[PDB]
Amino acid sequence: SVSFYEIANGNEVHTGSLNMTANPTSHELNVSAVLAAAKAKYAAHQLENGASVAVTTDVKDLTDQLTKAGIKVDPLGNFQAQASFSFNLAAKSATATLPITVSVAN
Amino acid sequence: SVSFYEIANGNEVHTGSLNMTANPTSHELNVSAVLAAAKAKYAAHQLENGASVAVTTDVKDLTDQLTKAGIKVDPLGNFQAQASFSFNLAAKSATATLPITVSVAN
């Protein structure tokens, strides 16, 4: 009964996607900018009586997801970007996940 | 210089996908069957002199990825399935990741 939607237009989604640019000199991304891009684009709710549902994923959850995928993240949150990688957003009222695939211009 | 390909036809890929069916009574999936489905479909290599590259993700890596996405996995590897979720396969010669989105018939 928890579903995700695109903020800009209100359409329900069951997968997500992001286009990002890495730093032009170091070719790095920061974990906190990936999470903020995701939460600027997607949100969650419960349908009717209907209400917003909190997205529980925080910056250390995302750091741990990436670390277990073989990606190395330094103490500042920076990591060398891949052309393609993914992570899950979680929401809890009833739990639900939104898989997000990221493409990086590098 | 590491790339992934579909085993059945040899086409290079930069994202992956899987269709799975959960257990008809419990609605559960096991982590080890998800990983075996992924490795039956996708592999990695380095292009020329060319050679196969090992996929390093094992069953405890995948368990830790899912746990950090809010999904609960019991000591036997079983978890209640979502309609949509994702994980990353890693390969190391030069590192590379393949994001895989799973859809579940439930």
Numbering used by the authors:
A (entry chain A), B (entry chain A): 213 to 260, 265 to 309, 314 to 326
Which of the paper's sentences describe this entry?
S-layer proteins (SLPs) are self-assembling, crystalline proteins coating the cell surfaces of many prokaryotes. We determined the atomic resolution structures of all functional domains (I-III from N- to C-termini) present in the three S-layer proteins SlpA_ac, SlpX_ac, and SlpA_amy. The Lactobacillus S-layers are anchored to the cell wall through interaction with teichoic acids (TA), either lipoteichoic acid (LTA) or wall teichoic acid (WTA).
The arrangement and architecture of SlpA_ac and SlpA_amy are highly similar. The N-terminal part, exhibiting the first two domains (SlpA_I and SlpA_II), is known to be responsible for the self-assembly of the S-layer protein into a regular lattice. The crystal structures of SlpA from L. acidophilus and L. amylovorus and observed crystal contacts reveal the self-assembly formation. One basic tile is composed of the homodimer of the full-length SlpA, dimerized at the SlpA_II domain. The self-assembly region (SA) is formed by domains SlpA_I and SlpA_II, building a 2D crystalline network that forms the exposed surface of the SlpA layer.
